[PDB]
Amino acid sequence: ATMTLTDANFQQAIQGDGPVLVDFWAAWCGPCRMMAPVLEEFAEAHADKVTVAKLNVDENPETTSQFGIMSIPTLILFKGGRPVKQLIGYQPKEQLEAQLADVLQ
Amino acid sequence: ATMTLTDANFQQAIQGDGPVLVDFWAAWCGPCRMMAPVLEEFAEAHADKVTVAKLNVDENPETTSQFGIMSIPTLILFKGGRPVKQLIGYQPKEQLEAQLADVLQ
Amino acid sequence: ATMTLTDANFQQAIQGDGPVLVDFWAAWCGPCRMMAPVLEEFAEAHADKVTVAKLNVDENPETTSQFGIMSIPTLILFKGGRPVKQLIGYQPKEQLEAQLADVLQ
Amino acid sequence: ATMTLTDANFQQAIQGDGPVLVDFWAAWCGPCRMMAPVLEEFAEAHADKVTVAKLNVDENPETTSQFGIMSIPTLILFKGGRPVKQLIGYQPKEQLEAQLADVLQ
């Protein structure tokens, strides 16, 4: 729910002003469907600690290839406009919050 | 030469007699770019044993989802309009050949 | 009756003469959910000739990789501790019966 | 200096009796190839303080999974066999120097 990223708006949309959690997803991806509500809820619950961004790899090959994405879904946390943490994309709320403890504090 | 398939024509294209090796790939996928020339060479060497088809998952989510694809690339061998073997998509030509030894015999 | 296996007990479960039909599935996979009731009825009807186990791929990544599962649903029949047959895709009662006529002896 | 690491010798080398900078890469990864010359130069002016090693993710699945590598290039600095810093994405010389300095004395 917070932002839709594209190869065109990525560079700007992920600069300075606040941590951005990018979810690399695909329409055909099953786990991404299970993760969709988890991320929506996460975005709502920590809307002031971080911004959740969605990058549909189906339509955005440059960014996806640029980060050497290997599996869908994949999560990458950006701070100061730079990727600082990477996580497998399938994560229950508990595990997701535990690993992102720092930014949520 | 490889055969390009879409969600719209996939069903008719895999209707049996004459094995079809389907490569589920994406342009942003690194291993897929490594395999492109490999599969084209493979197709040229075994054209009268099997047809190599390519299904771009970025553009064809229906077929991809129908087969519960989880990672790309993925190779699925079809015989009789039915999927009979599933293979890791990123493999050297020599390993692929061993894996498909029966259809190549 | 469709006992559940995991990465922690899979190996010894199959490391036996005992014919075991393993159902590789996930909650997000429609055809997988379509086959759960069929398999439950199947396990009940042929309990004397085969034991039906379920392996959720999202929760058990080790087993999923070891057996190169790239497409779900997939059924793998183990005999003597080794996979002897794989069935890819939704299998209605009649197909399962026909395909597994062997173990059904 | 560019010692090659594998699933077999990684943990051992990481318990390296000194800091080790591991470069996670693949032959399909452009920014990774771009980073290769940069890392060699770094390994040079810091060969008394750190060893630079390479781990190909395509050929070494266990290490790749062990460290949750979802995006490459990725560098992980180990100090005492434990990961102490992780850098994601291309790092120009100036960045490598600034980010790893606290390990450069």
Side-chain angles (χ1 to χ4, degrees):
Chain A
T2 311
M3 17 170 13
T4 296
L5 298 183
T6 62
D7 285 345
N9 76 22
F10 193 87
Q11 292 177 15
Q12 303 179 357
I14 223 163
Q15 194 191 71
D17 312 277
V20 178
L21 181 55
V22 179
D23 179 50
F24 289 80
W25 74 285
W28 53 263
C29 170
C32 301
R33 290 176 182 292
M34 308 295 286
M35 281 307 291
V38 177
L39 295 167
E40 284 181 0
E41 192 181 37
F42 182 86
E44 270 211 0
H46 320 268
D48 48 86
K49 267 59 184 179
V50 59
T51 300
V52 172
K54 301 185 109 309
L55 186 293
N56 178 3
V57 303
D58 300 357
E59 309 170 326
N60 297 288
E62 308 177 353
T63 306
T64 305
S65 183
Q66 175 85 234
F67 287 87
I69 301 306
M70 287 165 280
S71 48
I72 311 299
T74 283
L75 288 165
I76 303 190
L77 182 66
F78 289 74
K79 267 184 171 179
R82 308 176 313 140
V84 298
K85 190 157 187 174
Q86 57 188 311
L87 301 69
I88 1 60
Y90 176 71
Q91 293 268 17
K93 187 182 72 175
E94 178 173 33
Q95 300 180 1
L96 178 63
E97 293 192 66
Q99 297 179 85
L100 294 177
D102 306 355
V103 303
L104 304 189
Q105 156 167 46
Chain B
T2 53
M3 197 178 156
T4 297
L5 297 184
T6 69
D7 281 331
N9 60 38
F10 189 82
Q11 295 188 20
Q12 267 188 40
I14 46 157
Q15 297 198 333
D17 182 21
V20 182
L21 179 64
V22 175
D23 183 44
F24 289 88
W25 70 290
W28 53 261
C29 156
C32 300
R33 296 193 303 274
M34 295 302 288
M35 293 302 293
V38 175
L39 291 170
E40 293 191 327
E41 172 175 346
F42 181 89
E44 279 158 27
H46 308 114
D48 303 302
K49 295 291 177 182
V50 61
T51 298
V52 177
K54 296 203 69 91
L55 188 290
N56 188 324
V57 304
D58 286 351
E59 303 174 304
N60 299 282
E62 294 179 16
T63 303
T64 306
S65 177
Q66 181 199 309
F67 290 85
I69 294 299
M70 296 167 281
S71 59
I72 69 159
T74 285
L75 291 161
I76 297 184
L77 181 65
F78 286 95
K79 279 183 168 182
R82 143 197 201 54
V84 302
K85 195 163 184 175
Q86 58 190 300
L87 306 67
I88 293 299
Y90 187 26
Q91 214 176 150
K93 184 184 188 191
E94 326 95 55
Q95 267 177 50
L96 184 49
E97 293 173 323
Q99 208 65 233
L100 295 165
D102 181 8
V103 189
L104 295 184
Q105 169 182 16
Chain C
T2 77
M3 28 108 327
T4 300
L5 291 175
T6 61
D7 284 331
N9 58 33
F10 197 82
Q11 289 304 320
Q12 284 310 307
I14 69 133
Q15 213 113 1
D17 82 71
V20 184
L21 181 73
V22 179
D23 171 46
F24 290 91
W25 73 290
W28 47 263
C29 161
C32 297
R33 296 195 308 277
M34 295 187 249
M35 253 222 319
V38 181
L39 287 173
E40 310 159 302
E41 191 48 39
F42 187 85
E44 149 171 344
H46 316 263
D48 68 292
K49 269 171 286 188
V50 59
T51 304
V52 191
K54 295 181 70 176
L55 187 295
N56 179 291
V57 303
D58 298 329
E59 299 170 336
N60 301 289
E62 293 176 32
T63 299
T64 303
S65 307
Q66 189 183 329
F67 296 89
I69 299 308
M70 314 296 295
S71 177
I72 52 165
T74 283
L75 286 162
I76 293 183
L77 181 68
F78 288 92
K79 196 175 301 181
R82 292 241 78 190
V84 296
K85 198 170 196 186
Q86 266 195 26
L87 297 187
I88 303 176
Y90 177 75
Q91 308 290 319
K93 173 182 183 297
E94 304 178 0
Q95 282 303 126
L96 267 183
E97 276 174 38
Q99 294 304 303
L100 308 169
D102 72 292
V103 86
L104 300 181
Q105 294 175 15
Chain D
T2 328
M3 86 177 282
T4 303
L5 297 186
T6 62
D7 274 353
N9 71 6
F10 190 82
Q11 289 299 314
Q12 178 188 122
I14 249 48
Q15 289 310 137
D17 309 27
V20 180
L21 178 65
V22 180
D23 175 33
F24 291 81
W25 74 289
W28 46 258
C29 175
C32 299
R33 296 291 306 185
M34 290 274 298
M35 279 302 293
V38 175
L39 290 168
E40 310 198 323
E41 280 296 313
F42 185 79
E44 185 185 327
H46 303 119
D48 61 302
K49 305 184 204 304
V50 69
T51 285
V52 177
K54 286 187 182 298
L55 190 109
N56 180 297
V57 297
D58 292 340
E59 305 166 340
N60 297 288
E62 303 299 352
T63 295
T64 305
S65 65
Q66 272 182 39
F67 290 82
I69 301 296
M70 300 273 119
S71 168
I72 55 174
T74 287
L75 294 159
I76 293 184
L77 179 66
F78 287 94
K79 196 167 188 183
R82 179 180 185 170
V84 288
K85 190 97 179 307
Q86 182 177 126
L87 295 173
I88 300 170
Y90 184 83
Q91 305 292 307
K93 170 181 190 297
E94 300 179 2
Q95 290 301 321
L96 262 189
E97 295 289 1
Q99 291 288 311
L100 321 165
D102 340 58
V103 182
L104 289 189
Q105 306 172 325

mmCIF file of all heavy atoms in Angstrom, chain B residues 34-63:
data_model
loop_
_atom_site.group_PDB
_atom_site.id
_atom_site.type_symbol
_atom_site.label_atom_id
_atom_site.label_comp_id
_atom_site.label_asym_id
_atom_site.label_seq_id
_atom_site.Cartn_x
_atom_site.Cartn_y
_atom_site.Cartn_z
ATOM 1 N N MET B 34 22.386 -16.729 -18.659
ATOM 2 C CA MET B 34 23.471 -17.702 -18.862
ATOM 3 C C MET B 34 22.942 -18.871 -19.704
ATOM 4 O O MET B 34 23.627 -19.365 -20.615
ATOM 5 C CB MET B 34 23.981 -18.275 -17.531
ATOM 6 C CG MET B 34 24.661 -17.282 -16.566
ATOM 7 S SD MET B 34 26.087 -16.427 -17.284
ATOM 8 C CE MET B 34 27.315 -17.755 -17.362
ATOM 9 N N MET B 35 21.726 -19.317 -19.389
ATOM 10 C CA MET B 35 21.111 -20.436 -20.099
ATOM 11 C C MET B 35 20.574 -20.169 -21.500
ATOM 12 O O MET B 35 20.374 -21.111 -22.258
ATOM 13 C CB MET B 35 19.971 -21.062 -19.281
ATOM 14 C CG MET B 35 20.389 -21.766 -17.988
ATOM 15 S SD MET B 35 21.583 -23.124 -18.231
ATOM 16 C CE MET B 35 20.570 -24.297 -19.119
ATOM 17 N N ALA B 36 20.326 -18.915 -21.855
ATOM 18 C CA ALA B 36 19.779 -18.627 -23.192
ATOM 19 C C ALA B 36 20.581 -19.260 -24.337
ATOM 20 O O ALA B 36 20.021 -19.976 -25.173
ATOM 21 C CB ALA B 36 19.656 -17.106 -23.407
ATOM 22 N N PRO B 37 21.901 -19.001 -24.392
ATOM 23 C CA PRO B 37 22.725 -19.582 -25.466
ATOM 24 C C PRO B 37 22.851 -21.088 -25.311
ATOM 25 O O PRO B 37 22.950 -21.811 -26.297
ATOM 26 C CB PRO B 37 24.094 -18.925 -25.304
ATOM 27 C CG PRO B 37 23.966 -17.947 -24.226
ATOM 28 C CD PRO B 37 22.704 -18.191 -23.465
ATOM 29 N N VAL B 38 22.891 -21.559 -24.066
ATOM 30 C CA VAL B 38 22.995 -22.993 -23.812
ATOM 31 C C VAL B 38 21.788 -23.732 -24.402
ATOM 32 O O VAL B 38 21.939 -24.731 -25.118
ATOM 33 C CB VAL B 38 23.058 -23.315 -22.289
ATOM 34 C CG1 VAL B 38 23.029 -24.836 -22.074
ATOM 35 C CG2 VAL B 38 24.319 -22.732 -21.679
ATOM 36 N N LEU B 39 20.590 -23.236 -24.099
ATOM 37 C CA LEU B 39 19.372 -23.860 -24.605
ATOM 38 C C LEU B 39 19.255 -23.742 -26.123
ATOM 39 O O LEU B 39 18.700 -24.622 -26.769
ATOM 40 C CB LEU B 39 18.139 -23.250 -23.938
ATOM 41 C CG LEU B 39 18.018 -23.605 -22.454
ATOM 42 C CD1 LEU B 39 16.925 -22.766 -21.808
ATOM 43 C CD2 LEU B 39 17.759 -25.097 -22.307
ATOM 44 N N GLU B 40 19.757 -22.656 -26.702
ATOM 45 C CA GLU B 40 19.686 -22.534 -28.159
ATOM 46 C C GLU B 40 20.624 -23.541 -28.820
ATOM 47 O O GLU B 40 20.286 -24.137 -29.855
ATOM 48 C CB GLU B 40 19.983 -21.094 -28.595
ATOM 49 C CG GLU B 40 18.881 -20.165 -28.133
ATOM 50 C CD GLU B 40 18.952 -18.788 -28.731
ATOM 51 O OE1 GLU B 40 20.075 -18.295 -28.978
ATOM 52 O OE2 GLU B 40 17.875 -18.188 -28.936
ATOM 53 N N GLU B 41 21.795 -23.755 -28.219
ATOM 54 C CA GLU B 41 22.727 -24.738 -28.763
ATOM 55 C C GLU B 41 22.125 -26.139 -28.604
ATOM 56 O O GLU B 41 22.181 -26.972 -29.515
ATOM 57 C CB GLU B 41 24.068 -24.685 -28.038
ATOM 58 C CG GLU B 41 25.001 -25.823 -28.446
ATOM 59 C CD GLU B 41 26.378 -25.711 -27.824
ATOM 60 O OE1 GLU B 41 26.707 -24.636 -27.294
ATOM 61 O OE2 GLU B 41 27.143 -26.706 -27.887
ATOM 62 N N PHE B 42 21.557 -26.387 -27.433
ATOM 63 C CA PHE B 42 20.925 -27.665 -27.133
ATOM 64 C C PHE B 42 19.822 -27.959 -28.152
ATOM 65 O O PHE B 42 19.704 -29.088 -28.638
ATOM 66 C CB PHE B 42 20.336 -27.627 -25.713
ATOM 67 C CG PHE B 42 19.660 -28.908 -25.276
ATOM 68 C CD1 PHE B 42 20.388 -29.915 -24.655
ATOM 69 C CD2 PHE B 42 18.294 -29.096 -25.484
ATOM 70 C CE1 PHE B 42 19.757 -31.095 -24.208
ATOM 71 C CE2 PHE B 42 17.650 -30.256 -25.050
ATOM 72 C CZ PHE B 42 18.381 -31.266 -24.420
ATOM 73 N N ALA B 43 19.022 -26.943 -28.468
ATOM 74 C CA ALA B 43 17.911 -27.064 -29.418
ATOM 75 C C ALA B 43 18.405 -27.430 -30.809
ATOM 76 O O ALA B 43 17.788 -28.221 -31.519
ATOM 77 C CB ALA B 43 17.157 -25.760 -29.493
ATOM 78 N N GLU B 44 19.512 -26.813 -31.195
ATOM 79 C CA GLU B 44 20.116 -27.054 -32.486
ATOM 80 C C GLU B 44 20.704 -28.456 -32.563
ATOM 81 O O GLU B 44 20.718 -29.070 -33.621
ATOM 82 C CB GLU B 44 21.206 -26.015 -32.736
ATOM 83 C CG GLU B 44 20.665 -24.679 -33.239
ATOM 84 C CD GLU B 44 21.618 -23.518 -32.994
ATOM 85 O OE1 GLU B 44 22.844 -23.755 -32.918
ATOM 86 O OE2 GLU B 44 21.136 -22.366 -32.887
ATOM 87 N N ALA B 45 21.185 -28.981 -31.448
ATOM 88 C CA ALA B 45 21.778 -30.307 -31.496
ATOM 89 C C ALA B 45 20.778 -31.444 -31.375
ATOM 90 O O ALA B 45 21.031 -32.552 -31.859
ATOM 91 C CB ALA B 45 22.836 -30.436 -30.427
ATOM 92 N N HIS B 46 19.626 -31.174 -30.770
ATOM 93 C CA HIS B 46 18.652 -32.230 -30.561
ATOM 94 C C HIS B 46 17.266 -31.982 -31.131
ATOM 95 O O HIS B 46 16.300 -32.580 -30.680
ATOM 96 C CB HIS B 46 18.548 -32.507 -29.057
ATOM 97 C CG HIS B 46 19.869 -32.751 -28.407
ATOM 98 N ND1 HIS B 46 20.417 -31.880 -27.467
ATOM 99 C CD2 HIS B 46 20.778 -33.738 -28.532
ATOM 100 C CE1 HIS B 46 21.575 -32.324 -27.066
ATOM 101 N NE2 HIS B 46 21.831 -33.479 -27.710
ATOM 102 N N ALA B 47 17.188 -31.124 -32.143
ATOM 103 C CA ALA B 47 15.918 -30.762 -32.777
ATOM 104 C C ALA B 47 14.996 -31.895 -33.214
ATOM 105 O O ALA B 47 13.787 -31.693 -33.336
ATOM 106 C CB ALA B 47 16.185 -29.853 -33.963
ATOM 107 N N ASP B 48 15.518 -33.084 -33.476
ATOM 108 C CA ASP B 48 14.591 -34.123 -33.895
ATOM 109 C C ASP B 48 14.279 -35.110 -32.790
ATOM 110 O O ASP B 48 13.673 -36.165 -33.013
ATOM 111 C CB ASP B 48 15.104 -34.796 -35.166
ATOM 112 C CG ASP B 48 15.329 -33.794 -36.289
ATOM 113 O OD1 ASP B 48 14.360 -33.098 -36.668
ATOM 114 O OD2 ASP B 48 16.467 -33.685 -36.781
ATOM 115 N N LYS B 49 14.670 -34.736 -31.578
ATOM 116 C CA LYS B 49 14.402 -35.545 -30.399
ATOM 117 C C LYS B 49 13.453 -34.742 -29.520
ATOM 118 O O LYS B 49 12.533 -35.292 -28.921
ATOM 119 C CB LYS B 49 15.676 -35.806 -29.592
ATOM 120 C CG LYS B 49 16.744 -36.635 -30.289
ATOM 121 C CD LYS B 49 16.325 -38.079 -30.465
ATOM 122 C CE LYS B 49 17.397 -38.838 -31.235
ATOM 123 N NZ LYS B 49 17.003 -40.243 -31.468
ATOM 124 N N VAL B 50 13.676 -33.433 -29.460
ATOM 125 C CA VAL B 50 12.856 -32.588 -28.607
ATOM 126 C C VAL B 50 12.784 -31.146 -29.118
ATOM 127 O O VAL B 50 13.658 -30.696 -29.856
ATOM 128 C CB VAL B 50 13.434 -32.659 -27.164
ATOM 129 C CG1 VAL B 50 14.866 -32.131 -27.146
ATOM 130 C CG2 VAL B 50 12.538 -31.920 -26.179
ATOM 131 N N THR B 51 11.708 -30.448 -28.767
ATOM 132 C CA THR B 51 11.529 -29.053 -29.140
ATOM 133 C C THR B 51 11.710 -28.254 -27.864
ATOM 134 O O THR B 51 11.123 -28.580 -26.828
ATOM 135 C CB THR B 51 10.106 -28.770 -29.675
ATOM 136 O OG1 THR B 51 9.886 -29.546 -30.855
ATOM 137 C CG2 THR B 51 9.931 -27.283 -30.014
ATOM 138 N N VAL B 52 12.535 -27.223 -27.932
ATOM 139 C CA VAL B 52 12.757 -26.392 -26.770
ATOM 140 C C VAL B 52 11.857 -25.182 -26.906
ATOM 141 O O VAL B 52 11.903 -24.487 -27.908
ATOM 142 C CB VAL B 52 14.214 -25.934 -26.677
ATOM 143 C CG1 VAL B 52 14.371 -25.018 -25.495
ATOM 144 C CG2 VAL B 52 15.134 -27.137 -26.529
ATOM 145 N N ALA B 53 11.024 -24.950 -25.896
ATOM 146 C CA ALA B 53 10.106 -23.825 -25.913
ATOM 147 C C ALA B 53 10.462 -22.882 -24.765
ATOM 148 O O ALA B 53 11.024 -23.311 -23.753
ATOM 149 C CB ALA B 53 8.678 -24.327 -25.772
ATOM 150 N N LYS B 54 10.128 -21.608 -24.935
ATOM 151 C CA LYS B 54 10.417 -20.587 -23.942
ATOM 152 C C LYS B 54 9.127 -19.895 -23.532
ATOM 153 O O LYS B 54 8.319 -19.484 -24.378
ATOM 154 C CB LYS B 54 11.435 -19.594 -24.509
ATOM 155 C CG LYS B 54 12.796 -20.252 -24.804
ATOM 156 C CD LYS B 54 13.906 -19.233 -24.815
ATOM 157 C CE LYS B 54 14.169 -18.687 -23.431
ATOM 158 N NZ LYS B 54 15.197 -19.448 -22.684
ATOM 159 N N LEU B 55 8.924 -19.793 -22.226
ATOM 160 C CA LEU B 55 7.726 -19.170 -21.676
ATOM 161 C C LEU B 55 8.254 -18.076 -20.794
ATOM 162 O O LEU B 55 8.849 -18.365 -19.760
ATOM 163 C CB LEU B 55 6.922 -20.194 -20.841
ATOM 164 C CG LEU B 55 5.523 -19.901 -20.280
ATOM 165 C CD1 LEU B 55 5.568 -18.861 -19.153
ATOM 166 C CD2 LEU B 55 4.629 -19.433 -21.415
ATOM 167 N N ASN B 56 8.070 -16.826 -21.220
ATOM 168 C CA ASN B 56 8.535 -15.679 -20.442
ATOM 169 C C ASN B 56 7.554 -15.400 -19.297
ATOM 170 O O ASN B 56 6.445 -14.919 -19.521
ATOM 171 C CB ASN B 56 8.660 -14.448 -21.352
ATOM 172 C CG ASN B 56 9.320 -13.280 -20.644
ATOM 173 O OD1 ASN B 56 9.105 -13.075 -19.462
ATOM 174 N ND2 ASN B 56 10.124 -12.507 -21.369
ATOM 175 N N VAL B 57 7.972 -15.648 -18.061
ATOM 176 C CA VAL B 57 7.044 -15.491 -16.950
ATOM 177 C C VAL B 57 6.645 -14.058 -16.635
ATOM 178 O O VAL B 57 5.631 -13.847 -15.965
ATOM 179 C CB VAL B 57 7.568 -16.159 -15.657
ATOM 180 C CG1 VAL B 57 7.882 -17.659 -15.916
ATOM 181 C CG2 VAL B 57 8.801 -15.425 -15.154
ATOM 182 N N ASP B 58 7.450 -13.093 -17.091
ATOM 183 C CA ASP B 58 7.151 -11.665 -16.880
ATOM 184 C C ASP B 58 5.865 -11.341 -17.626
ATOM 185 O O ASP B 58 5.077 -10.491 -17.218
ATOM 186 C CB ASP B 58 8.236 -10.765 -17.483
ATOM 187 C CG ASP B 58 9.518 -10.764 -16.681
ATOM 188 O OD1 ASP B 58 9.516 -11.312 -15.568
ATOM 189 O OD2 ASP B 58 10.520 -10.200 -17.157
ATOM 190 N N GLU B 59 5.674 -12.020 -18.741
ATOM 191 C CA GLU B 59 4.509 -11.766 -19.581
ATOM 192 C C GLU B 59 3.430 -12.838 -19.575
ATOM 193 O O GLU B 59 2.343 -12.622 -20.107
ATOM 194 C CB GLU B 59 4.984 -11.536 -21.011
ATOM 195 C CG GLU B 59 5.987 -10.405 -21.118
ATOM 196 C CD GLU B 59 6.576 -10.262 -22.507
ATOM 197 O OE1 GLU B 59 7.135 -11.257 -23.026
ATOM 198 O OE2 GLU B 59 6.489 -9.149 -23.074
ATOM 199 N N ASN B 60 3.704 -13.972 -18.951
ATOM 200 C CA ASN B 60 2.740 -15.067 -18.951
ATOM 201 C C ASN B 60 2.560 -15.674 -17.574
ATOM 202 O O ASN B 60 3.025 -16.795 -17.304
ATOM 203 C CB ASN B 60 3.225 -16.124 -19.940
ATOM 204 C CG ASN B 60 3.320 -15.586 -21.359
ATOM 205 O OD1 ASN B 60 2.307 -15.449 -22.046
ATOM 206 N ND2 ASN B 60 4.536 -15.273 -21.801
ATOM 207 N N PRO B 61 1.847 -14.963 -16.694
ATOM 208 C CA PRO B 61 1.618 -15.431 -15.331
ATOM 209 C C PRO B 61 0.653 -16.590 -15.188
ATOM 210 O O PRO B 61 0.743 -17.360 -14.222
ATOM 211 C CB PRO B 61 1.108 -14.180 -14.639
ATOM 212 C CG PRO B 61 0.197 -13.602 -15.717
ATOM 213 C CD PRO B 61 1.155 -13.675 -16.916
ATOM 214 N N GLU B 62 -0.259 -16.739 -16.143
ATOM 215 C CA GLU B 62 -1.248 -17.804 -16.049
ATOM 216 C C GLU B 62 -0.642 -19.204 -16.099
ATOM 217 O O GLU B 62 -0.922 -20.045 -15.242
ATOM 218 C CB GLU B 62 -2.319 -17.632 -17.140
ATOM 219 C CG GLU B 62 -3.158 -16.381 -16.932
ATOM 220 C CD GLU B 62 -4.226 -16.151 -18.004
ATOM 221 O OE1 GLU B 62 -4.545 -17.090 -18.771
ATOM 222 O OE2 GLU B 62 -4.762 -15.020 -18.070
ATOM 223 N N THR B 63 0.189 -19.450 -17.106
ATOM 224 C CA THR B 63 0.842 -20.742 -17.257
ATOM 225 C C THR B 63 1.820 -20.961 -16.101
ATOM 226 O O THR B 63 1.890 -22.042 -15.510
ATOM 227 C CB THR B 63 1.612 -20.801 -18.598
ATOM 228 O OG1 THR B 63 0.706 -20.531 -19.675
ATOM 229 C CG2 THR B 63 2.224 -22.173 -18.804
#
